[PDB]
């Protein structure tokens, strides 16, 4: 498609019906945001074969410069934190420029779960484990991974002003290397190197 | 519901199947928004018994400080102005304070209308008249109003920051009178006095 449906960026399709998925993701060192309307998040997630879909990753936070985790599977979005809430969340997150590894298991015992390696911006080095309780996911049609300046409403797409650059490196599902294929660039360049991906917004 | 879904704010439900609705809007002499995560929204709309929900009214600008047309009906929210685009949007709204006369057509010739008469930022009285085409809208399950500060995902919530009044008055509904039913009350005080509400956000 030409644009995004709830605002700007890039997306990628990863052509995996898998359950785990990996991959190392390098954070913008610089982030405009100069708008009063749009939230920069870059995340994956997939859509399941019963039609649920998951965004599963990170949002930046204006009022405290880090990246802190973003969760959603269908109409769930009630995040639970196993370990690490007073490291990454609140007045601390991953911090700018840093490189976070993820982790996403779409069913632990019936929940789905994301956790995240990397430092905050107290130069801790730590973990912090995420959940959605109760998802039950069964199979999956095919994941994905953007990076996005989201707005609430449609009308507001023209006043969004967002400029950052990310990269999902050595993107796994199921222990084996998937390579993304480029699907929506929407005031973002979208560059596949193998099982990486960068995406570059600017608006 | 102690929760508004997508934000905070106060809700009720005007228990009419009818076709036109009428409201005069005071808007907010004040608007407190010191956040950097959400949007002040005002409006009305229904549910469709078909299940199609439509929100239909203002949005706050806080980048021009007015109110400008803000309409969504199920999966459509590209609006087509029919009338009144260069007086009332981008850089021009309804002024802080001033009343708006507002008039919603679920369905004239397949077509969602919102027709808004009153005074923009510039002292100019006049009208903007805004669709959302090919709806095609049925019978009415129930008509709603709200005042609202939403976000675009759920863990924003504690961020939020809005303190902002606004009243509906004299609510009709196929030119009968329609007293609304108090509904949420999250971080607003909701007060009904006949066809008449008043919303008061404070968060």
Sequence with gaps: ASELPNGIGGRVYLNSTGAVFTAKIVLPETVKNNDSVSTP??????????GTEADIGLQYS??????????????????????????????????????????????????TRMTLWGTNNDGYTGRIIT????????????????????????SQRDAIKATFST?????????????PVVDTQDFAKVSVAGNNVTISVNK
Tied chains: 1, 2.
């Design 131 to 154: 959940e959605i309780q109760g998802t039950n996911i069964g199979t999956i049609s095919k994941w994905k991974t953007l990076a996005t300046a989201a707005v609430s409403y449609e």
């Design 41 to 50: 998040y870059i995340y994956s997630g997939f859509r399941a074969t019963s």
């Design 62 to 111: 204006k009022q405290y410069n880090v990246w802190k985790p973003l969760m959603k599977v269908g109409s769930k979005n009630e995040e639970t934190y196993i370990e690490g809430k007073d490291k990454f969340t609140y007045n601390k997150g991953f911090r700018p420029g840093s490189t976070v590894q993820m982790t996403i298991y779409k069913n632990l015992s019936g929940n």
């Design 167 to 179: 990269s999902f490196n050595n993107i796994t599902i199921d222990n084996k290397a998937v390579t």
